[PDB]
Design a protein around this ligand. Structure first.
Ligand code: PLM
Ligand code: PLM
Ligand code: MYR
Ligand code: MYR
Ligand code: MYR
Lengths: 61, 254, 281, 239, 61, 239, 281, 60, 61
């Protein structure tokens, strides 16, 4: 029941290394920190607009 | 047809009727049955007297009074003198049985009062004198009702029968966790509990072990008014079910 | 299900609230008869008009196992570093649940109990005050020996009994992790009995109560080290965890305070706490 | 050998830990399993069983007696009269606190779910009456009048052949869970009882009679954060 | 001979994580606590009735 | 290295533990296995073998002699006369206690199963007799009379060419297992022997003669909870 | 995504620079209206002619998890080796984030927070000065007990409460690796709240603020060892690591210094540091 | 048992470490997840939001 | 090269759990105790007879 995942390596000069995970305990709280999710959505803070603001257009018209 | 208030129970050469019952409680969901070949340990053939043992034994009935605190009986010991059940229990090291317990109490539309009727498994009672130990004669009078006390004290090696702690260090209002019914004089004239053999071992000695205790405790006191029949008894009749006995020898006590 | 096969569960969530509408009818879900011995299986939607709620709550920690399977202290015992002459150089404990108040009330909520047990034991030491308390005392090893009902009791800190040619023993050095064992369902009967309304003798006499059934044997404790010039005292705390549990016949929890570890005695207490008035805020 | 590296946590004894350990008695043939009726596999099964409440809680005298369980009713009692009142803190308020449900609650710090108070009339069979069974959610204060009580969640119980009527108390809360302990934020409101009409009787009947109240947890009930109870203690070991 | 099972996680906003088990000892007594069986049957205590009591009906008739 | 986390139990020495360990002599060529007759693979094989009981247990004088093993019978002994009696505590009662079965029992705390007492007549070939071999289960007390004994589990042994008769004692118990140690709860009842008729002989024959009793465990016997025996001890090491 | 399933990520790199050419047109990417409440999504290529750059940079360490999931000290507590008579022989801590300055500012950057937590605790000991400081003191074991809101407080270094028949406890010997636990999302509400602009009472009164919501229970600390002739003092540092984190509603970071662990009070500080002139080098 | 050999690093507490640990509350049923608007999953989302600068910075 | 075997459990009310074994050392002497072989043959001690003694028959004839 082992999980294989990808290690944080770095941009190589013009790669994929893996690591292994086995969860030892019966409680998900006991698991490692969720450090590899680089997901984001600034939209809700940077643009909470009802009417979509198109950059090349004037903001007011 | 068939009003669910009316009931007829027949066991051996015995029938009890009631025209004001409130269903019947099968202890822990289980109807009594015989010890099976998987669960057995005593290798000898059991004697199963069927109708001769498994029938309705009416024990000495007690009087309910306005201030009367409560009563208990101990099984199988209460039946140690009841006919051939008693004899079989006397001549055998081991015995096993379930029971149909039927408590009777009738009064009138004009009377009021409510009793808890409960079968407590392993109701191991405390000594009144916390320092000392209790003893059999203050634990059971066989077929005669042992009374609960309103008074917080008793004679040498008597049980602490103070009703609100049910003789065993707990809240009497929680006794309801055990197989129980209530005879509320407004509603019904009888209670019926069908108790299975509840114990940690397949058979046991009929004298040494009081497998369960029947407690009848008045939560709402008996009352009536100006000249309306004073005497109102409570009668307990019980029938052994699926009774079988192992290990036969001489007449037994010691 | 198999209480010994731990990694094999059953996910059972709590019941959802179904939406109720208004009603005007002959069916009466909240009118019943307590006398019956039955508990009302009413849901709020039988009395009010409810919305639809999805209860993903689970009755997790109230499982008999999660409730009992937390390691509790049942007793602690004390013994000094000494010679054959010193009675206090070793000690023993007759194994029993009824010695402490907390685990006893938990177990006693059930009449009959069948489980395996994890025993952990925290043995702690301290220097006795003495002119010699200055002393280079080396690491102390300890011996815990189980003597099952029938075997030889150790009469001294130093006798043949401690050989343990057949009794189970644990040798433990200080500084290390606490000693731990697992125990099977050790009883002669099909379940442990927290209560016995009965007698040790067929003639309705001898010992009354649970004591009669719960003959578990005993734990003997000693230091394996020879004594240093100044005495050192050790105290062993025995911890119990009921694991792989099964329980039968629920009881009311103990209202009255416990008095004896030997018997079920109590002195009568009030049913509940008193309040100012029957109409309270 | 295999290059192991010990992490924090190593060699501690956590009371709640769930690890494998060696058995001190190898290959022990355990006593064969038998049936035994009445298996409890979850404490909520006990909380779901009806206990009777000590609502007649006025004095130490009646609390160490059977009076505690019986609420006294009377004939010719005026219409809007209050029978009783208290705030709903199951496991904390003396009325429900040490019942089966209350006791189970006291080994936990968080509760959730609906409660059902089953009101049983133990008066004369020849006697009659109607009562308003109320539950006011928090925020407003305890219902001072039958009209105030009426405005909240309620049942009007008409006593008759079906002895008992159940007041089903809904889980109405901001949060998914409340504390077992009394807490201002997790307040649960007030359950009160009132004469909707009155208790009436015939000629040679008793004037005062009694009602009694059972309480238990409905199928949506649950408990969290396991803890030791305040209900039991000792100074020394027992002997 | 490894066993894979499910970890206790929690209700997610509108999941399955696993853990591994290998029994090291020859005696079932040595095994982890049976903590994941949330099974129940209040019926035996809440309803020990011979005749089935239907909620919408009167208890007595 | 591989993140290991040490649990409780770590570094203890449990006497009953079952772990792998390094051998101090690697690749040792062990002496090749040969047959050898009489392999014991389970101590119950020994308990199942017939030993002779010291029932003639009256005095230190006879206990440190062969008398201990022979029970004395006599001609013209009246009919209901008792030969012997004792309660069945195998491994605890002096009569069976230190026999092969008894000795095996004494390394354990729990026993179970049926026992068989083989009665052998070692009187004159020309002699005759009938005996009641009884086993009374507990609860009633020891059988005081041949009639009391008769009521329980019994064999009436007629002595003749087949020298010996076996009294098979059934496992009749509340529990699946009894203690090896004498315990009031795990009491096993009483085995007694009686003249069913009498020992009769011809003219120049000896009047007193002897019976002897073998005991062993039947195929349903077993033992649990391994322990040290009280039967052996020392103050110091031997030299 | 599942914050508890650690070994399951999402690689999201930073945005590349696209090449811009000269322009002369009616489209105005850098002329907008702040009033809108909108932030300009301008890129340098809208104002300058840029080259093509490939940004393989990733916003790794600024993830809420990598930011909060570094184990911080929240509090330390002290206790001596002693008898029932000695008040100082044991100690306790009501669990709270707001006691220290550093982790508090980090967590408080978000209004609502939901996470699991790794608690590590460094317990350290020292010899008290005494005529007896010469003393052979054996290895000290320690007990940390969590008492959830409602359970029995230990009144002495030596009472029934320390049995822990149901409370979680850790027993730890000195010299070993620091004790460590994981904690679930313990709250009654769907997320922890670092701020509560509200009251403990429906009548707009009682306790104001976050205190009202954050009832976490407490940690009791003691030595398990009996006292050696000279006293030894121990001090326990409780460390917290928010793992499996989710965060809602970002806030401005705390400008003013913290005053009370109980409330959000501050005394007014300047918006920024002052400088020499509005035209600075 | 299985011949383990402990490496350097053993038993240290590194503040930034990422290891599994036992939970002190087993099988705890966590409060069910709800929506809540405004989820921050990366601090750069905050740095990308417009603040107003104290450029008129001349005096206390 | 792992071995899977059966754990000692117990008679269940009207089961099979497993454990894993890997031998770490080059010498069979180093292995765990042979505790699970409940085999027996009392015959050699209880019945060493040349002529088979049938129970229902007389021992001598
Ligand atoms: C060093 C070896 C130690 C072995 C210890 C054996 C301990 C036996 C424990 C028996 C626990 C019995 C629990 C009884 C519960 C009850 O009925 O109250
Ligand atoms: C020995 C067992 C210890 C168990 C410790 C339980 C600790 C509970 C910790 C609660 C952390 C709460 C974080 C609140 C964050 C906030 O809103 O500021
Ligand atoms: C899936 O889990 C099976 C893959 C192989 C597992 C090797 C297990 C490593 C050693 C056991 C870890 C057990 C933790 C309880
Ligand atoms: C089934 O058990 C084989 C699956 C792979 C096993 C990996 C074993 C991990 C290391 C050995 C544990 C041995 C315990 C005695
Ligand atoms: C068969 O042996 C291969 C099965 C998988 C083996 C997992 C090995 C566990 C770790 C190594 C133990 C090595 C002992 C020298």
């Amino acid at each position: 029941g082992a999980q294989v995942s990808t290690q944080k390596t770095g941009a190589h000069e013009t790669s994929i290394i893996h690591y292994t995970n086995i969860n030892y305990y019966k409680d998900a709280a006991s698991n490692s920190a969720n450090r590899q999710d680089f997901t984001q959505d600034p939209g809700k803070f940077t643009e909470p607009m009802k009417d979509v603001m198109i950059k090349t257009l004037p903001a007011l018209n | 047809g068939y009003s669910d208030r009316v009931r007829s129970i027949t066991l051996g050469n015995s029938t009890i009727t009631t025209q004001e019952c409130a269903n019947v409680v099968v202890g822990y969901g289980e109807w009594p049955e015989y010890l099976s070949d998987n669960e057995a340990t005593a290798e000898d053939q059991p004697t199963q007297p069927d109708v001769a043992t498994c029938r309705f034994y009416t024990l000495d009935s007690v009087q309910w009074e306005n201030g009367s605190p409560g009563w208990w009986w101990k099984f199988p010991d209460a039946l140690r003198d009841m006919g051939l059940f008693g004899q079989n229990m006397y001549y055998h090291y081991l015995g096993r049985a379930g029971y149909t317990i039927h408590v009777q109490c009738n009064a009138s539309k004009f009377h009021q009062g409510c009793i808890l009727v409960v079968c407590v498994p392993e109701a191991e009672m405390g000594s009144a004198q916390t320092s000392g130990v209790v003893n059999y004669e203050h634990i059971s009078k066989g077929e005669i009702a042992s009374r609960f006390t309103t008074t917080t004290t008793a004679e040498d090696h008597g049980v602490q029968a103070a009703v609100w702690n049910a003789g065993m260090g707990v809240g009497v209002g929680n006794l309801t966790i055990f197989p129980h019914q209530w005879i509320n004089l407004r509603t019904n004239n009888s209670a019926t509990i069908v108790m299975p053999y509840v114990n940690s071992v397949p058979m046991d000695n009929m004298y040494r072990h009081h497998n369960f205790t029947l407690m009848i405790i008045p939560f709402v006191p008996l009352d009536f008014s100006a000249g309306a029949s004073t005497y109102v008894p409570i009668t307990v009749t019980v029938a052994p079910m699926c009774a079988e006995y192992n290990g036969l020898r001489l007449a037994g006590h010691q | 299900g198999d209480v010994q096969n731990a990694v094999e569960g059953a996910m059972v969530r709590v019941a959802d609230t179904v939406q109720t509408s208004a009603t005007n009818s002959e069916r009466v879900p909240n009118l019943t008869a307590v006398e019956t011995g039955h508990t009302s299986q009413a849901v709020p939607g039988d009395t009010m008009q409810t919305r639809h709620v999805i209860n993903n709550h689970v009755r997790s920690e109230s499982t008999i196992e999660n409730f009992l399977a937390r390691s509790a202290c049942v007793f602690y015992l004390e013994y000094k570093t000494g010679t054959k002459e010193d009675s206090n150089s070793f000690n023993n404990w007759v194994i029993t649940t009824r010695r402490v108040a907390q685990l006893r009330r938990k177990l006693e909520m059930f009449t009959y109990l069948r489980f395996d047990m994890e025993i952990t034991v925290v043995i702690t030491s301290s220097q006795d005050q003495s002119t010699s308390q200055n002393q280079n005392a080396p690491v102390l090893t300890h011996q815990i020996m189980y003597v099952p009902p029938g075997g030889p009791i150790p009469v001294s800190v130093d006798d043949y009994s401690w050989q343990t040619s057949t009794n189970p023993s644990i040798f433990w050095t200080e500084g290390n992790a606490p000693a731990r064992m697992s125990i099977p369902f050790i009883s002669i009967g099909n379940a442990y009995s927290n209560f016995y309304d009965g007698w040790s003798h067929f003639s309705q006499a001898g010992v009354y109560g649970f004591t009669t059934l719960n003959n578990m044997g005993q734990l003997f404790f000693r230091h394996v080290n020879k004594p240093n010039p100044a005495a050192i005292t050790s105290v062993a705390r025995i911890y119990f965890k009921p694991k792989h549990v099964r329980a039968w016949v629920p009881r009311p929890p103990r209202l009255c305070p416990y008095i004896n570890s030997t018997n079920v005695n109590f002195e009568p207490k009030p049913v509940t706490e008193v309040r100012t008035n029957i109409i309270t805020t | 050998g295999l290059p192991t590296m010990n992490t924090p946590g190593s060699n501690q004894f956590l009371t709640s830990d769930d690890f494998q350990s060696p058995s001190a008695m190898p290959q022990f043939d355990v006593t064969p399993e038998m049936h035994i009726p009445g298996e409890v596999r979850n404490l909520m099964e006990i909380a779901e069983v009806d206990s009777v409440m000590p609502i007649n809680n006025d004095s130490a005298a009646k609390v160490s007696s059977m009076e505690a369980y019986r609420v006294e009713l009377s004939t010719n009692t005026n219409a809007g009269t209050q029978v009783f009142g208290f705030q709903l803190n199951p496991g904390a308020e003396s009325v429900m606190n040490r019942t089966l449900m209350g006791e189970i609650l006291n080994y936990y710090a968080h509760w959730s779910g609906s409660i059902k108070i089953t009101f049983v009339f133990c008066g004369s069979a020849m006697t009659t009456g109607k009562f308003l069974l109320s539950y006011a959610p928090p925020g407003a204060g305890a219902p001072k009048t039958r009209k105030d009580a009426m405005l909240g969640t309620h049942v009007v119980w008409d006593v008759g052949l079906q002895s008992s009527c159940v007041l089903c108390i809904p889980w109405i809360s901001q949060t998914h869970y409340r504390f077992v302990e009394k807490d201002p934020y997790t307040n649960a409101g007030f359950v009160t009882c009132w004469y909707q009409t009155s208790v009436v009787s015939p000629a040679s009947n008793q004037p005062k009679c009694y009602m009694m109240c059972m309480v238990s947890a409905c199928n949506d009930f649950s408990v969290r954060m396991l803890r030791d109870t305040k209900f039991i203690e000792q100074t020394s070991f027992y002997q």
